[PDB]
Write a protein that binds this ligand. Structure first.
Ligand code: HEM
Ligand code: HEM
Ligand SMILES: *[C@@H]1O[C@H](CO)[C@@H](O)[C@H](O)[C@H]1NC(C)=O
Ligand SMILES: *[C@@H]1O[C@H](CO)[C@@H](O)[C@H](O)[C@H]1NC(C)=O
Ligand SMILES: *[C@@H]1O[C@H](CO)[C@@H](O)[C@H](O)[C@H]1NC(C)=O
Ligand SMILES: *[C@@H]1O[C@H](CO)[C@@H](O)[C@H](O)[C@H]1NC(C)=O
Ligand SMILES: [Ca+2]
Ligand SMILES: [Ca+2]
Lengths: 146, 10, 244, 141, 281
């Protein structure tokens, strides 16, 4: 969707400081922990039952990394959203048939992990902007379902 | 008829 | 349905999505070439108990298959509607049977015992409490009837009955109902999932029977057992009705 | 489904919130009008501006309701019955909104109380607000 | 009587559990309807298990199975056996197995009270030994009457009794008693009213503690306000220095401290900067 310059500016400036080797994996393993039925898709990793196993298992953060990157690529060019996730959308929707609502849940746990790290400096307007972002992402990723 | 979906779940 | 199992193939061709007058999406299942079961409850949304069939029939909108709109002639209510929660919808014409659209067989045998597992489809809400954009489905085991009774109310013996229901409203629990347990991953069935059939696939003779229809769809996250009204118990009633 | 573990966790975490429960309740409300303007259509006559006293007090109310619920949590729906009927019937609030406010309340509480939000708690907190928002919604028809 | 057997089941020992009666070779249970301490006293005597200590519903030992043998029992508590109390007859009940009564007897319960990490042997975090294991108690509803009973049992002065944990660590393991509400005349804490054993919502941050004092070791002073009548409120309890938190601190509390200290009335709780003495935990 269209976005006014100071949201995108606060977004990118904030996104610079985001640690790219941890945050994504923490959002992913947190989605796994809070809504354990997604473990169904990832259980090739190992024991996902307790939160400590999840937090330790190197393949959880290994996957999260690729997902966090893919989202960085989304946030980079937000005007052409359809094309960037078109292939990921084929992977998830046609072969896996992940229900697209857990995408937004993940985007929310992401913003949550963001807020967890960034405390008071992650403000309601900047959050509302990232919500807009993870929305546009969830939509573009879900576009081939209709 | 019973029991014949063109593509069942399995 | 809040959790997963996206319906990729359309393995459940008898599932119809009927929307009431105020845009409330609800389940109904196609029980034969001219008829579909549903619940009295589902039928009664946005209408008074005073309302009769002639009043209710034009209000509803019904959808089969993908968008496929089948029209609807009359409506008939179970004589025990307030106890046995079941309607019947008769479709104005026949539906073309094919891979995605086809009625389900009513079971002769009774698979109500614990240890069996079943498959419930649904158009209901999910964990964002949004009406789902695409039909989904879930597998559920069947649950000990006594554990379920003691769960929703307090009693067994009817004088000790009190409203113990985790939600506001009390479900109907009698000898014409059975309870299905919670999922393996704690998935369950929510608003909009009433009227969908609890369909058990019989592997030896390879047929999918509708053993029950979902009555109480309020349980969602909070209430450990969904509860269905056995279809077998309305067996001899539905046949009588089909003749008219 | 709120196991003993969850319940304990939710109590221990919501205690450490204490008297700040009110202002978070209000901060959360602010976010929804800023994040999801459609919820504003339920509050026509309210002053929606930043830190509005009206907002601050309504937030103190929702906060105190929640504290009441968690004080005796093993039967919540009796305690919350009058709010069940208040939001369900009179106000006719569309059930997505409770899940909205639930999530705003979790982000806000997260932001302000970093040390206690280990995943187990984020879990049982989301379950707790689920169970409540249901009980308020569950008399819908 | 040769075909009548009694046992307690699932209470970790032979003196605690759901009531099971063997009759004509089948075990069955007893309903908790009108069940009371006199029934348990009969049972604990019959099993030579000592005095009755606790009764509870099915929640603690789980649901039984089979026939319910007895319901609405009326014992006076002096009968030599439970099946000699007046009853409506074998197998007459309105109960389900979720209403199966259970008991805990004193020889199967094993109770002891101790203080841990106290300033004295009669202050500290309160721990109860139950069936051989020690655990702490949560502070929910813990009041001065409970502390007074504990202090009396330890033989310490009971003129002043504080709640809370001074130098006491957080407990671990079981929380045995919750929401204790005693009247103060009971000779021991486990005969006051409490919820069912081991069912709790407390965490070890909410562990109850006590300090029992005769009042001679309680000092109050103001420090750092330039005089003895202005400053931070410092307290000395059992030779431990600490400070009063301002949460709930109003003009009434300050006026009480100044009046008790002969400093007149509280005018105002303010800043006056200073070199104040630091710090406490
Ligand atoms: C909405 C934001 C999402 C993004 C940006 C994303 C991105 C990615 C990426 C980058 C990969 C790795 C592709 C590769 O190796 O080249 C992947 C794989 C995968 N995605 Fe996601 N994903 C998202 C949501 C989800 C969710 C929520 C699920 C399931 C709950 C899911 C299911 C999967 C699975 C199962 C794989 C592994 C496929 C395999 O290795 O066989 N996707 N995704
Ligand atoms: C966790 C779920 C919720 C809780 C605990 C809650 C709590 C409360 C409380 C305590 C009141 C005041 C009751 C009274 O004054 O008698 C109230 C009123 C109200 N609630 Fe909520 N509420 C919830 C969800 C919602 C949501 C999601 C919305 C809309 C987005 C909403 C809209 C309203 C409105 C419009 C009022 C009336 C305000 C007024 O006119 O004073 N409620 N709610
Ligand atoms: C639904 O029920 C309400 C409550 O009586 C009624 O006023 C309304 O007309 C009905 N229909 C719609 C579409 O809301
Ligand atoms: C809700 O129903 C009204 C009245 O029939 C209609 O105008 C509107 O389009 C419906 N909304 C949806 C989302 O179906
Ligand atoms: C409805 O219940 C009543 C009361 O038991 C019974 O007499 C009647 O036959 C029931 N209806 C049908 C169609 O069986
Ligand atoms: C309190 O602090 C330590 C740690 O428990 C303890 O050894 C000490 O005796 C106590 N304080 C005093 C003043 O005795
Ligand atoms: Ca009785
Ligand atoms: Ca007390």
């Amino acid at each position: 969707v269209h976005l006014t310059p100071e949201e995108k500016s606060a977004v990118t400036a904030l996104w610079g400081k985001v640690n790219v080797d941890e945050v994504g994996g923490e959002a992913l393993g947190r989605l796994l922990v809070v809504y354990p039925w997604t473990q169904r898709f990832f259980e090739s990793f190992g024991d996902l039952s307790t939160p400590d196993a999840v937090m330790g298992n190197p393949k959880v953060k290994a996957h999260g990394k690729k997902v966090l990157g893919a989202f960085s690529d989304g946030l980079a060019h937000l005007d052409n959203l359809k094309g960037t996730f078109a292939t990921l959308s084929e992977l998830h929707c046609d072969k896996l048939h992940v229900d697209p609502e857990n995408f937004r849940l993940l985007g929310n746990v992401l913003v949550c992990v963001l807020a967890h790290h960034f405390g008071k400096e992650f403000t309601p307007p900047v959050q509302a902007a990232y919500q807009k972002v993870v929305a546009g992402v969830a939509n573009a990723l879900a576009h081939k379902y209709h | 008829v019973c029991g014949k979906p063109k593509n069942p779940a399995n | 349905i809040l959790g997963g199992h996206l319906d990729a193939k359309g393995s459940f061709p008898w599932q119809a999505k009927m929307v009431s007058h105020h845009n409330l999406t609800t389940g109904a299942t196609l029980i034969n070439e001219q008829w579909l079961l549903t619940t009295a409850k589902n039928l009664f949304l946005n209408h008074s108990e005073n309302a009769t069939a002639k009043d209710i029939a034009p209000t509803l909108t019904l959808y089969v298959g993908k968008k496929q709109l089948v029209e609807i002639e009359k409506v008939v209510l179970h004589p025990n509607y307030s106890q046995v929660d079941i309607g019947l919808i008769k479709l104005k014409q026949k539906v073309s049977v094919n891979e995605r659209v086809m009625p389900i067989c009513l079971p002769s045998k009774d698979y109500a015992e614990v240890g069996r597992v079943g498959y419930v489809s649904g158009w209901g809400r999910n964990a964002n409490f949004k009406f789902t954009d695409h039909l989904k489905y879930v597998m559920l085991p069947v649950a000990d009837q006594d554990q379920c009774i003691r769960h929703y109310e307090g009693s067994t013996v009817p004088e000790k009955k009190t409203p113990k229901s985790p939600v506001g409203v009390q479900p109907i629990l009698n000898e014409h109902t059975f309870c299905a347990g919670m999922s393996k991953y704690q998935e369950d069935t929510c608003y909009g999932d009433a009227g969908s059939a609890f369909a058990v696939h019989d592997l030896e003779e390879d047929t999918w029977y509708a053993t029950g229809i979902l009555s109480f769809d309020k349980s969602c996250a909070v209430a450990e057992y969904g509860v269905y009204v056995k279809v077998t118990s309305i067996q001899d009633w539905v046949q009588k009705t089909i003749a008219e | 489904v709120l196991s003993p573990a969850d319940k304990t966790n939710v109590k221990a975490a919501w205690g450490k919130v204490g008297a700040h429960a009110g202002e978070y309740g209000a901060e959360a409300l602010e976010r929804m009008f800023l994040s999801f303007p459609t919820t504003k259509t339920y509050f026509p006559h309210f002053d929606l501006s930043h830190g509005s006293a009206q907002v601050k007090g309504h937030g103190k109310k929702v906060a105190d309701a929640l504290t009441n619920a968690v004080a005796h949590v093993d039967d919540m729906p009796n305690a919350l019955s009058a709010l069940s009927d208040l939001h369900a019937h009179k106000l006719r609030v569309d059930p997505v909104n409770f899940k909205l406010l639930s999530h705003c309340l979790l982000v806000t509480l997260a932001a302000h109380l970093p040390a206690e939000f280990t995943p187990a708690v984020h879990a049982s907190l989301d379950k707790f607000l689920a169970s409540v928002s249901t009980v308020l919604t569950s008399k819908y028809r | 009587g040769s075909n009548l057997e009694m046992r307690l089941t699932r209470g970790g020992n032979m003196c605690s559990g759901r009531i099971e009666i063997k009759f004509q070779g089948r075990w069955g249970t007893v309903c908790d309807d009108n069940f009371n301490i006199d029934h348990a006293s009969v049972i604990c005597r019959q099993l030579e298990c000592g005095s009755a200590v606790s009764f509870s519903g099915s929640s603690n030992f789980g649901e039984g199975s089979g026939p319910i043998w007895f319901d609405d029992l009326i014992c006076n508590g002096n009968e030599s056996a439970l099946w000699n109390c007046k009853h409506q007859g074998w197998g007459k009940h309105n109960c389900d197995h979720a209403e199966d009564a259970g008991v805990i007897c004193s020889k199967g319960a094993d109770l002891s009270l101790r203080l841990v990490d106290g300033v004295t042997e009669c202050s500290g975090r309160l721990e109860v030994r139950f069936q051989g294991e020690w655990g702490t108690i949560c502070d929910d509803g813990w009041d001065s009457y409970d502390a007074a009973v504990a202090c009396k049992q330890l033989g310490c002065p009971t003129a002043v009794t504080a709640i809370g944990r001074v130098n006491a660590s957080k407990g671990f393991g079981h929380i045995w008693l919750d929401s204790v509400s005693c009247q103060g005349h009971e000779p021991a804490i486990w005969q006051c009213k409490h919820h069912e054993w081991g069912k709790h919502y407390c965490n070890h941050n909410e562990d109850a503690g006590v300090t029992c004092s005769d009042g001679s070791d309680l000092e109050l002073r103001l420090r750092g306000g330039g005089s003895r009548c202005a400053g931070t409120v410092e307290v000395e309890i059992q030779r431990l220095l600490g400070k009063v938190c301002d949460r709930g601190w109003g003009l009434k509390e300050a006026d009480v401290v100044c009046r008790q200290l002969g400093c007149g009335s509280a005018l105002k709780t303010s800043y006056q900067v200073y070199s104040k003495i630091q710090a406490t935990n």
